[PDB]
Design an enzyme around this catalytic site. Structure first.
Site, PDB file in Angstrom:
ATOM      1  N   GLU A  66       0.952  -1.252  -0.068  1.00  0.00           N
ATOM      2  CA  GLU A  66      -0.011  -0.055   0.000  1.00  0.00           C
ATOM      3  C   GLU A  66       0.812   1.365   0.059  1.00  0.00           C
ATOM      4  O   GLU A  66       2.125   1.349   0.545  1.00  0.00           O
ATOM      5  CB  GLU A  66      -1.044   0.081   1.319  1.00  0.00           C
ATOM      6  CG  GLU A  66      -2.137   1.212   1.279  1.00  0.00           C
ATOM      7  CD  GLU A  66      -3.131   0.777   0.302  1.00  0.00           C
ATOM      8  OE1 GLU A  66      -3.036   0.592  -0.796  1.00  0.00           O
ATOM      9  OE2 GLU A  66      -4.201   0.505   0.887  1.00  0.00           O
ATOM     10  N   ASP A  94      -1.769  -5.230   1.317  1.00  0.00           N
ATOM     11  CA  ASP A  94      -1.277  -4.082   1.902  1.00  0.00           C
ATOM     12  C   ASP A  94       0.170  -4.305   2.252  1.00  0.00           C
ATOM     13  O   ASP A  94       1.046  -3.508   1.887  1.00  0.00           O
ATOM     14  CB  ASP A  94      -2.099  -3.853   3.041  1.00  0.00           C
ATOM     15  CG  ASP A  94      -3.690  -3.274   2.902  1.00  0.00           C
ATOM     16  OD1 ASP A  94      -3.827  -2.559   1.986  1.00  0.00           O
ATOM     17  OD2 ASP A  94      -4.503  -4.172   3.315  1.00  0.00           O
ATOM     18  N   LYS A 120     -14.142  -9.058   3.985  1.00  0.00           N
ATOM     19  CA  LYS A 120     -12.864  -9.061   3.591  1.00  0.00           C
ATOM     20  C   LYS A 120     -12.404 -10.333   3.104  1.00  0.00           C
ATOM     21  O   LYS A 120     -12.000 -10.729   2.136  1.00  0.00           O
ATOM     22  CB  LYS A 120     -11.855  -8.702   4.473  1.00  0.00           C
TER      23      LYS A 120
HETATM   24  O1  LIG Z   1      -6.221  -1.801  -0.844  1.00  0.00           O
HETATM   25  C1  LIG Z   1      -6.949  -0.770  -0.870  1.00  0.00           C
HETATM   26  N1  LIG Z   1      -7.029  -0.003  -2.183  1.00  0.00           N
HETATM   27  C2  LIG Z   1      -7.869   1.198  -2.556  1.00  0.00           C
HETATM   28  C3  LIG Z   1      -7.198   2.372  -3.148  1.00  0.00           C
HETATM   29  C4  LIG Z   1      -8.252   3.577  -3.217  1.00  0.00           C
HETATM   30  C5  LIG Z   1      -8.072   4.768  -2.804  1.00  0.00           C
HETATM   31  C6  LIG Z   1      -8.892   5.895  -2.730  1.00  0.00           C
HETATM   32  C7  LIG Z   1     -10.024   5.893  -3.703  1.00  0.00           C
HETATM   33  C8  LIG Z   1     -10.277   4.467  -4.337  1.00  0.00           C
HETATM   34  C9  LIG Z   1      -9.358   3.419  -4.078  1.00  0.00           C
HETATM   35  O2  LIG Z   1     -11.510   4.442  -5.109  1.00  0.00           O
HETATM   36  C10 LIG Z   1     -12.719   4.603  -4.331  1.00  0.00           C
HETATM   37  C11 LIG Z   1     -13.842   3.718  -4.058  1.00  0.00           C
HETATM   38  C12 LIG Z   1     -13.838   2.819  -3.151  1.00  0.00           C
HETATM   39  C13 LIG Z   1     -12.608   2.991  -2.018  1.00  0.00           C
HETATM   40  O3  LIG Z   1     -12.895   3.956  -0.861  1.00  0.00           O
HETATM   41  C14 LIG Z   1     -12.342   3.503   0.454  1.00  0.00           C
HETATM   42  C15 LIG Z   1     -12.626   4.041   1.528  1.00  0.00           C
HETATM   43  C16 LIG Z   1     -12.414   3.673   2.901  1.00  0.00           C
HETATM   44  C17 LIG Z   1     -11.405   2.575   2.835  1.00  0.00           C
HETATM   45  C18 LIG Z   1     -10.572   1.816   1.674  1.00  0.00           C
HETATM   46  C19 LIG Z   1     -11.336   2.411   0.579  1.00  0.00           C
HETATM   47  C20 LIG Z   1      -9.627   0.626   1.494  1.00  0.00           C
HETATM   48  N2  LIG Z   1      -9.000   0.634   0.585  1.00  0.00           N
HETATM   49  C21 LIG Z   1      -7.809  -0.423   0.552  1.00  0.00           C
HETATM   50  C22 LIG Z   1      -7.690  -1.479   1.643  1.00  0.00           C
HETATM   51  O4  LIG Z   1      -6.687  -2.299   1.718  1.00  0.00           O
HETATM   52  C23 LIG Z   1      -8.415  -0.993   2.853  1.00  0.00           C
HETATM   53  O5  LIG Z   1      -8.401  -1.542   3.955  1.00  0.00           O
HETATM   54  N3  LIG Z   1      -9.435  -0.155   2.925  1.00  0.00           N
HETATM   55 MN   LIG Z   2      -6.250  -2.690   3.493  1.00  0.00          MN
HETATM   56 MN   LIG Z   3      -4.644  -1.899   0.583  1.00  0.00          MN
END
Ligand SMILES: O=C1NCCc2cccc(c2)OC/C=C\COc2cccc(c2)-c2nc1c(O)c(=O)[nH]2
Ligand SMILES: [Mn+2]
Ligand SMILES: [Mn+2]
Ligand SMILES: C[C@H](C[C@@H](C[C@H](C[C@@H](C[C@@H](CCN1CCCC1=O)N1CCCC1=O)N1CCCC1=O)N1CCCC1=O)N1CCCC1=O)N1CCCC1=O
Length: 181
Positions: A66, A94, A120
């Site tokens: 990440e 991650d 998950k």
């Molecule tokens: O790996 C990951 N990747 C997501 C990368 C990302 C960053 C910003 C915008 C995005 C994609 O597009 C938007 C549509 C939906 C996503 O919005 C959320 C909101 C809160 C948490 C997360 C994602 C979350 N992402 C991951 C995790 O591993 C994790 O635990 N949590």
């Molecule tokens: Mn994650």
């Molecule tokens: Mn992630």
């Protein structure tokens, strides 16, 4: 839409490098931090949690996935897989623990701790990658009760999460964050 003023707290609360990384990550997927401020905060918190997780190990115990460009974040996973012979995950993880040779998927939940795991584990059928969830209330849940890390490191983690929660409650934006998922 003008400003957001919650993003002001997001900027004053988090590491500038973490803020920039979360900003570029959100912009990669066509999302605006200036409008999706609850998002902004969530991705910043996830970034910070992953960073303290990687720091709480040894020296080469964790390869950080990440916080990278999607293309490079995939290149490093392909390298890890051709190295250790581990099956590549269907979804980008991650961290990668070299000590126990497994992809750790860090979850920073907002609702019940059980629900984030119930989502998950269902998302990634690759039962090899590990899953570890922290809570803002101060709870956690790992895969097969294998929490990988120590206990003082994880405690410092949950302390940071509750400090962020208290800071959000001070400026009275905590229910707006809890009701945005
Ligand atoms: O790996 C990951 N990747 C997501 C990368 C990302 C960053 C910003 C915008 C995005 C994609 O597009 C938007 C549509 C939906 C996503 O919005 C959320 C909101 C809160 C948490 C997360 C994602 C979350 N992402 C991951 C995790 O591993 C994790 O635990 N949590
Ligand atoms: Mn994650
Ligand atoms: Mn992630
Ligand atoms: C490797 C480099 C950056 C790392 C991210 C992170 C930086 C580290 C900063 C140190 C100082 N500490 C430690 C105490 C607080 C602090 O401030 N921490 C950790 C906590 C938050 C933070 O900021 N860590 C952690 C492991 C070693 C390292 O450097 N990243 C970014 C994603 C991939 C990666 O490895 N980057 C930047 C991008 C290109 C690159 O290679």
């Amino acid at each position: 839409p003008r400003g957001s003023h919650m993003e002001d707290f997001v900027r004053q609360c988090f590491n500038p490098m973490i803020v920039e990384l979360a900003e570029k990550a959100m912009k990669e997927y066509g999302e605006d931090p200036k409008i999706e401020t609850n998002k902004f905060a969530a991705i910043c918190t996830h970034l910070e949690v992953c960073f303290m997780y990687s720091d709480g190990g040894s020296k080469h115990r964790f390869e950080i996935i990440e916080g990278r460009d999607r293309i490079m974040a995939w290149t490093v996973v392909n390298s890890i897989c051709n190295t250790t012979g581990v099956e590549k995950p269907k979804f980008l993880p991650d961290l990668y623990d070299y000590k126990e040779n497994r992809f750790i998927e860090i979850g920073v939940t907002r609702r019940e701790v059980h629900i984030y795991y119930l989502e998950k584990a269902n998302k990634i059928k690759s039962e090899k990658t590990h899953i570890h969830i922290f809570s803002f209330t101060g709870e956690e849940m790992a895969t097969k009760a294998d929490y990988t890390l120590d206990e003082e490191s994880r405690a410092r983690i949950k302390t940071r999460l509750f400090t962020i929660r208290q800071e959000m409650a001070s400026r009275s934006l905590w229910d707006s964050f809890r009701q945005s998922e």
